[PDB]
Amino acid sequence: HMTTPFMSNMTGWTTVNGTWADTIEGKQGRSDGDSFILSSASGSDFTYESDITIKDGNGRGAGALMFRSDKDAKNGYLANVDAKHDLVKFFKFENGAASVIAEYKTPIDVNKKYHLKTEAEGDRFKIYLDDRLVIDAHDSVFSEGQFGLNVWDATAVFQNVTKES
Ligand SMILES: OC[C@H]1O[C@@](CO)(OC[C@H]2O[C@](O)(CO)[C@@H](O)[C@@H]2O)[C@@H](O)[C@@H]1O
Ligand code: NA
Ligand code: NA
């Protein structure tokens, strides 16, 4: 029977762009720019988390959780680990244009598993890196939408991708 090594409680994964696959390590994405995959799962308030490992390829950029997204990932929130810029970023896309909401600055590495967790509750967003709170910010732009994953100028692997509402 069909099985995948990607572990998640979410289904319906639809590739927006980039190169996305399920490998023995998890769901891998790669692109030089931003690229996105969206689950059919949707929500408003939730805990959304994943293991994220940035690999050697492309520009050793970033891997991200995306949430409260529209169908083509043009509008939504992201929380990432960015090895190139050494930060955890909470940001939004509005009609395909990015703007930063909050950051935590820390050295971020390639070939190191990170655990990233977002708790989205109304207009408040708490982001944890390896179980430590690093961002606790407010933003009112988006209230609901799809869950997904992103990479920016990176190859990255996502494993144990889960949401709880
Ligand atoms: O952290 C990666 C994440 O950063 C974004 C949004 O800040 O921008 C990437 C990169 O693009 C520019 O805006 C210009 O090319 C730079 O200022 C920034 O380093 C997202 O696009 C990406 O997912
Ligand atoms: Na599954
Ligand atoms: Na780095």
Phi, psi angles (nearest 5°) of residue 143: -110, -25
Q: Is the CB of 62 under 6 A from ligand 1?
A: yes
Q: Which ligand is nearest to the CA of 154?
A: 1
Task: For ligand 1, atom 20, name the residue with the nearest CA.
Answer: 98
| Domain 1-165 superfamily per CATH | Exo-inulinase; domain 1 (2.60.120.560)
Resolution for this experimental structure (Å): 1.1
| Of the candidates 133, 147, 82, 80, the residue with the CA atom closest to the CA atom of residue 108 | 82
The label of the residue with tokens 């050793």 reads: 60
How many angstroms separate the most distant Cα atoms in the chain? 45
- State which approach was used to obtain the coordinates: X-ray
Written as six digits, the tokens of 119 are 């708790």
Strands (E), 44-130: 46-54, 62-69, 76-82, 87-94, 97-105, 113-121, 124-129
Distance 3 CA to ligand 3 centre (A): 34
Alpha-helical segments (H) within the chain:
none
Q: Which residues contact 142 (CB under 8 A, 6 or more apart)?
A: 68, 75, 76, 77, 92
Residue 131 phi/psi, 5-degree rounding, is 75, 15
Give the C-alpha separation, 81 to 160, whole Å: 16
